[PDB]
Structure 1
Amino acid sequence: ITKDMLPGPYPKTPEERAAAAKKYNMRVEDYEPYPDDGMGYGDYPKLPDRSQQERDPWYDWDHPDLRLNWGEPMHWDLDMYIRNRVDTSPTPVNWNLMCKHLFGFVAFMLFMFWVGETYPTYQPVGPKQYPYNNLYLERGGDPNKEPEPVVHYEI
């Protein structure tokens, strides 16, 4: 390695842009660095921002695990777009329709759960009757305090 192969400041002159494109091993027309807004990116190229799952899996890749070649410029977020991580594959259904359908499904069933909680179902019976003043001593009540007499009558 040597000094003039490491990344540097943002290129301004077209000659510096061509030198940076030759350093990063691609065409000058395809070399688009990050905009110099002062975020610290520098002269690193702005790759088309897609995951490694969208690459060709049948190609003889140098690194078939990551689907990457040798000497090709890596993405700034290559650790995010590996196959172990976030995928940007084209879905058969549009994103907005999927999100709206899922939110409507969840919201509708939550609303119907609340409505059913408002109006419960039961069976036409009275309360269950337990003996000995509704089991006052068996519910952990103190034996000194005599409970209020609850009497259940035959029906």
Structure 2
Amino acid sequence: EPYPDDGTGYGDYPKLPDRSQQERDPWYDWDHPDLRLNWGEPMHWDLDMYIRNRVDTSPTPVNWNLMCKHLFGFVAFMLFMFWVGETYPAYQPVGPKQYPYNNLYLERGGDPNKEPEPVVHYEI
């Protein structure tokens, strides 16, 4: 079956099935065991894309459309739940843990000139 004559340069090159090389009898004595080809066999136009180190098209236990629904759903729900948890944080009952000397003004790179407005914390 020649490729469609749409003027994309295919010419009279056979259009073999779009099947990966992993979808071949692994036990048949191949002339090229790794490639799973036979000497004198017309090679697929995209043979270099269907080698075993690349795109595979073997049948899957779960239908393609069903897999996409599950994976996206898990990703979609999880992201939504993270947003809910971000705007509703869980914080224990505590106060603004205090620090002395104007809340560590000089320890936190405070500028000695233009001294800060005094801040103090009382016992309780």
TM-score range, shorter chain: over 0.9
Whole-angstrom distance in 2 between the partners of 1:143 and 1:62: 83
What CA deviation, in whole Å up to 9, does each residue of 1:68-107 have, x standing for no partner? 0000000000000000100001000001110010000001
Which portions of structure 1, spanning 4 or more consecutive aligned residues, are displaced by more than 3 angstroms? none
Offset of residue 145 of structure 1:
1.5
Whole-angstrom distance in 2 between the partners of 1:132 and 1:118: 34
- 1:144 pairs, out of 90, 102, 113, with 113
* TM-score normalised by the chain length of structure 2: 0.99
* TM-score normalised by the chain length of structure 1: 0.79
List runs of 5+ in structure 2 lacking aligned partners. Answer: none
Offset of residue 60 of structure 1:
0.3
Whole-angstrom distance in 2 between the partners of 1:63 and 1:100: 39
Offset of residue 46 of structure 1:
0.5
Offset of residue 144 of structure 1:
1.0
Q: Identity of paired residues, percent?
A: 98
Whole-angstrom distance in 2 between the partners of 1:61 and 1:138: 75
Whole-angstrom distance in 2 between the partners of 1:89 and 1:80: 14
SS at 1:99 equivalent: helix
- Work out the number of aligned pairs and report it: 124
SS at 1:64 equivalent: coil
C-alpha root-mean-square deviation of aligned residues, in Å?
0.5
Whole-angstrom distance in 2 between the partners of 1:149 and 1:89: 73
Task: Find the counterpart in structure 1 of residue 99 from structure 2.
Answer: 130
Offset of residue 141 of structure 1:
1.1
Whole-angstrom distance in 1 between the partners of 2:78 and 2:45: 42
Offset of residue 110 of structure 1:
0.2
1:23-62 to 2 correspondence within 5 Å?
Answer: 32-62=1-31
